[PDB]
Symmetry: C3
Amino acid sequence: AEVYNKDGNKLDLYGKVDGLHYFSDNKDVDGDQTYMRLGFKGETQVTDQLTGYGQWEYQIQGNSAENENNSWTRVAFAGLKFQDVGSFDYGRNYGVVYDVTSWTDVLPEFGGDTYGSDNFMQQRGNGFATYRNTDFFGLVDGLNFAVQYQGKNGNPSGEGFTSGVTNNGRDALRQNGDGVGGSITYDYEGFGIGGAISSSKRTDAQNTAAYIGNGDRAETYTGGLKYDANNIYLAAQYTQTYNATRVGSLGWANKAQNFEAVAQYQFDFGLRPSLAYLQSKGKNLGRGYDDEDILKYVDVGATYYFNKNMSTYVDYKINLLDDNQFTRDAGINTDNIVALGLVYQF
Amino acid sequence: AEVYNKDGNKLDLYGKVDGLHYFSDNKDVDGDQTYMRLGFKGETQVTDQLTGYGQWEYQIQGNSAENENNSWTRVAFAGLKFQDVGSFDYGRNYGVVYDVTSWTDVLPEFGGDTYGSDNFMQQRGNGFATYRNTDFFGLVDGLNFAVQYQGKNGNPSGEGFTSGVTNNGRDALRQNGDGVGGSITYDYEGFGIGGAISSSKRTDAQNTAAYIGNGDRAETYTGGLKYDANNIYLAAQYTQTYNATRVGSLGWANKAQNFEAVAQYQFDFGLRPSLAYLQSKGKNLGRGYDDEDILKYVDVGATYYFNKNMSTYVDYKINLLDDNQFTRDAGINTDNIVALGLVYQF
Amino acid sequence: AEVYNKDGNKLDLYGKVDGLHYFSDNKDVDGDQTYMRLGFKGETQVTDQLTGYGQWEYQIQGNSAENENNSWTRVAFAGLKFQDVGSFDYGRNYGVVYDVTSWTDVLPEFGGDTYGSDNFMQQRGNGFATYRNTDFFGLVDGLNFAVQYQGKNGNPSGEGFTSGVTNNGRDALRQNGDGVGGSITYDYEGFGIGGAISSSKRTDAQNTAAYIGNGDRAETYTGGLKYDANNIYLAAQYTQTYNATRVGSLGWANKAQNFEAVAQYQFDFGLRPSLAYLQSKGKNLGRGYDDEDILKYVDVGATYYFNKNMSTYVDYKINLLDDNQFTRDAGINTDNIVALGLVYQF
């Protein structure tokens, strides 16, 4: 919670430590996943109508030995917020789509893995500019909508590259060009209807013949429904991506028609049994397959909260993906996983 | 100290900065050792009988240049604590043995180097599960005992390995298998008697012919005495490890019979002169030596506290190890060291 | 600001998040420069005349992807401060010269780039020992002067080196030997006159034939003037370095006669228009050039503060360096840059 509050500025340092264990026949994930997150969320009141804010979060891994450090900045964004107008921020922030897919991201640890960090515009990414209007400037409540842009993160500097070079370059699986997107959402009577659209130009370092799924731009459409009332949570979402969904290490997919569903219930003592189904179907991707789903699994779990600071979760990912050549080339999991976690948070 | 305390939860952010300098003829340690530690120790009261807690500490090095970062998570563990029953935690935590050897870890900077981080079960390590009972459920005070388990941390993923692979793999000198251990301690009238036992299965990546000291399991026994009264501190400890004591880079030792002693005195203004002797004898290790001690030195030092936040220490490690072929192969220090430190802590 | 204050010790955790964007034809800097800084500045009152303090700052980069972490410790120093005597600190701290050149370091993001971190003695560096006397032990106010020493940071350990090895070695462009320096400054009636002198022995790893500018020691002289009154800021500074000014990657320069000037004005609402000119002339360096300036540019910018926590700056670096062979060998920028930043700070 808030730790400093005086002279027109408040600042809370938040975070968590998660002692986590993965049990899987797939020895690439089996083991210990203990980690932590630490960050701050500061906000100042410039005037009775203008606000400023800065948030930052840093995830560190606690399962590595003493002689290596695994950690990364999840979010680091600064902006302003003018009342009944909206808020504008810049930095490394969440994607336009994430929010609606965040409706199906209420799992203990798994779930919402039809995308990853440093994807096109569908999760955490750098170079973001987001304008989020709340209540349509007061016409009606729970009618928010956002417009967002992102700049290019091309090839790294110093690696002999001569085209598509940016000071913060990276591997081609995580690069991107100039992209724009929007989102619209209405949440009333508990019922929530959300929609997102995004497009992003692709770089030449990604248009190579090694990575599959060549295309000019990446275009994502998402439509989702949600229901959160009387200790019940239901959510469904359907996304269609064109040249915008990763396929292991082989690159991306031409199309991807994934339909996610999740249902949870909150009991009067702190038990939350969750059931979430995910299927992401790759279609007309190429290389001889020309049709094969990227992901298919169910997740049955239970989270037990003792308060708003201490909790523990059990999770069971039943993977319904048989081992074939496409999976073995892409490196996509096919085994059932168990996740036992103990989370402290402040 | 505590910085946030309200709504049934308290959280203290603690740490220190240490401006340290090493003076040694061994140019591998001679130079600047300035560093810092930062972390949090949060605790919430679930019920009048059930507690939750989470601690985390991160050590960063301040003697490196601007273009590299040296740091690592020392401890990151979360658990619960039920009164007159005990506490159970998980994550990266301290070993079963450490506590009793912690009796001989009261030196300024040196001392307690018969083990290192990511050893078998004798210091900080990942994948820990520890149940510590206090006062034998109330029968008698100062009679605590702990039972602890640790899982395997095998070979890294993505390095072509096909056996003993875990998601948090590392080098073979720091791997381990499934291990279990216990400890029992009685501290009354200042007199403290402690004992620890630990065993750990070894992985096949460690059973190679390159690293010496092949064996099925690693077995450590420790017995120690302590005395802390009327501004006096005495401590002695004897450990015997089988296939569990590192020998530089060549692997481990078959046996190791180390006997540590330490004596310090606290004066009425803040002076603490410390004298600590360490000898760790490797026996029947192989490769032609078949008998040679791993470590032998004395440490004379003085710590001056100005308060509970600011202190400065002088330390003099007289190394009684002559330079032979075994040391030069293992990379074990043989020179006398001086350590001048200025420590601020909060 | 201060977050913990009780029992004779105070501690403030400070920092900032900066959403920054660089626009440049030089694709090595063009892109996103969003970053953050986090640290603590603790201080305890030992006696009514003796103080202890410890500061630490850590800069992390937020423009990198999820699978790499760019960060570094900027300052980490601990010391004591006896009233009307002075303060002594050790660790990674700022250089003797920086302060006077800090008079021309009042730019939004650019400026003060005639040196870099891990230079000889003119900015942040490790192994520092600084004694700063304030008011000449009370004879006259605003007459402070400092004496500072630094030890060697030679070659890294484990890289087959046999001479000039330190436990915290680095690349030869950032090494150094035993150096000493002093500084004297008088600030009265707003008028400030500052002067600094520094000398540093050079290591053999830097005396190679690959890096240009061979010489026994590095010697820097600096003289500067400042004026800060009635919402006006003027500053000028002249440095002459011998074997102490970096030249891209080719090593250093034999001489460097740089003359920096800056002028800013603070308006009654928060606008600060800044104009800063920098020229650093390399002379008699060798390799066939024998005369060529290291840097030459102007910077026109404007910073707008909304409070002491939220601000935003625009900056325009007009580079007056034409592209020749020397620049292309050294890797020195030649293009005009634009910098748009949004800074939140606590």
